[PDB]
Amino acid sequence: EAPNQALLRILKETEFKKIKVLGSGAFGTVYKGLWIPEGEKVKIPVAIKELREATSPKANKEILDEAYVMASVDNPHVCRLLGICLTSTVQLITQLMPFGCLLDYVREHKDNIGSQYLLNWCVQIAKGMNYLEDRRLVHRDLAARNVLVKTPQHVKITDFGLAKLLGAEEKEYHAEGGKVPIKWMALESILHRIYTHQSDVWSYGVTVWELMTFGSKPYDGIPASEISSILEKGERLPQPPICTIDVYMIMVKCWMIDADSRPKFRELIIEFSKMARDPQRYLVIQGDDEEDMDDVVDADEYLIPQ
Numbered sequence: 001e002a003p004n005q006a007l008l009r010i011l012k013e014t015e016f017k018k019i020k021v022l023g024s025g026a027f028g029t030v031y032k033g034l035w036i037p038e039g040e041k042v043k044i045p046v047a048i049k050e051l052r053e054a055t056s057p058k059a060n061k062e063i064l065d066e067a068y069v070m071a072s073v074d075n076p077h078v079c080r081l082l083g084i085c086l087t088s089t090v091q092l093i094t095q096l097m098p099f100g101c102l103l104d105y106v107r108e109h110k111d112n113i114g115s116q117y118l119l120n121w122c123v124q125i126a127k128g129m130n131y132l133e134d135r136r137l138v139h140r141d142l143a144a145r146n147v148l149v150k151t152p153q154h155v156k157i158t159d160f161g162l163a164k165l166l167g168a169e170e171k172e173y174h175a176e177g178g179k180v181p182i183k184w185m186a187l188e189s190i191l192h193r194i195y196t197h198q199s200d201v202w203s204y205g206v207t208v209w210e211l212m213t214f215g216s217k218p219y220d221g222i223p224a225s226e227i228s229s230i231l232e233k234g235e236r237l238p239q240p241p242i243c244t245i246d247v248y249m250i251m252v253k254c255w256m257i258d259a260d261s262r263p264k265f266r267e268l269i270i271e272f273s274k275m276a277r278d279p280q281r282y283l284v285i286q287g288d289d290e291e292d293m294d295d296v297v298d299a300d301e302y303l304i305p306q
């Protein structure tokens with residue numbers, strides 16, 4: 001197989017400064033911060049993810065496995081790891097996405113999200129996803145919560161906690177136990193623990209549904225145990241009121257039993273692009289930062305020779 005010549009950057013704790021907490025999960029604390037490299041005269045808005053507090057060797061392998069995947073990606077619609085900090089607790093340093101996750105964004109801005117925006121997000125998620133397919137990467141956790149907003153017009157795929165690299169003549173990934181998101185999972189993933197790029201396509205369909213419903217919970221109320229029995233019977237997520245048969249037919253195609261019958265991410269870019277050219281024909285919607293900001297540079301503009 002092809003050697004992975006990606007560069008993992010080790011950053012000094014002194015190079016960056018924590019401002020406030022963005023999220024305090026059971027896994028850790030994500031901090032809003034600023035990164036001032038060596039003597040570069042730049043301030044890079046960052047998101048610093050530290051592994052809870054305690055140093056357990058079991059979870060350190062998980063954060064470094066996430067660092068491996070995140071350092072091996074480079075696409076405008078995928079979040080790249082800026083570096084790692086080897087302190088008492090391992091810290092992942094990533095680009096600050098000022099508008100947070102897409103799921104919370106669609107819920108918080110329901111009344112100001114237009115058809116042009118929803119369809120553009122779909123194209124963008126399909127572009128980043130097709131890139132991961134080119135990189136032989138299976139996400140295994142694509143959802144609106146794992147799509148971050150850089151600007152309302154620019155979103156990127158993130159959270160490589162479950163991501164796996166295939167390569168050569170490996171077409172599918174076989175999993176173990178662990179907590180897995182059942183409501184975003186393809187049927188072969190629930191029944192056989194088989195993950196492919198086409199299983200990611202199913203998850204893409206559910207992500208699109210979340211967006212088109214403005215952040216509604218898929219199969220709301222239904223326990224994860226019943227999902228498998230529901231999908232096997234032929235039941236799928238409802239048509240969002242704003243969706244024309246055109247958009248819904250795309251979501252439906254992602255949820256077909258035969259994985260190879262589902263659309264490819266390169267076809268989803270094409271389909272949604274045609275739709276983004278005349279967004280009102282496809283979506284029916286009624287009525288459709290405290291420091292010296294002189295040297296602030298976004299991570300997408302801060303590059304080091306590759």
Ligand SMILES: CO[C@H]1CCN(c2nccc(Nc3cc4c(cn3)nc([C@@H](C)O)n4[C@@H](C)C(F)(F)F)n2)C[C@H]1F
Pocket residue numbers: 022023024027030046047049079092094095096097098099100101104148158159160
């Ligand atoms: C479980 O860890 C996740 C957390 C989100 N990760 C991430 N990846 C790339 C960039 C990035 N930046 C990033 C993440 C941000 C953010 C600004 N920038 N603002 C928020 C809140 C206020 O809405 N979040 C969320 C997702 C949280 F706090 F939970 F992280 N964050 C990917 C993994 F590290």
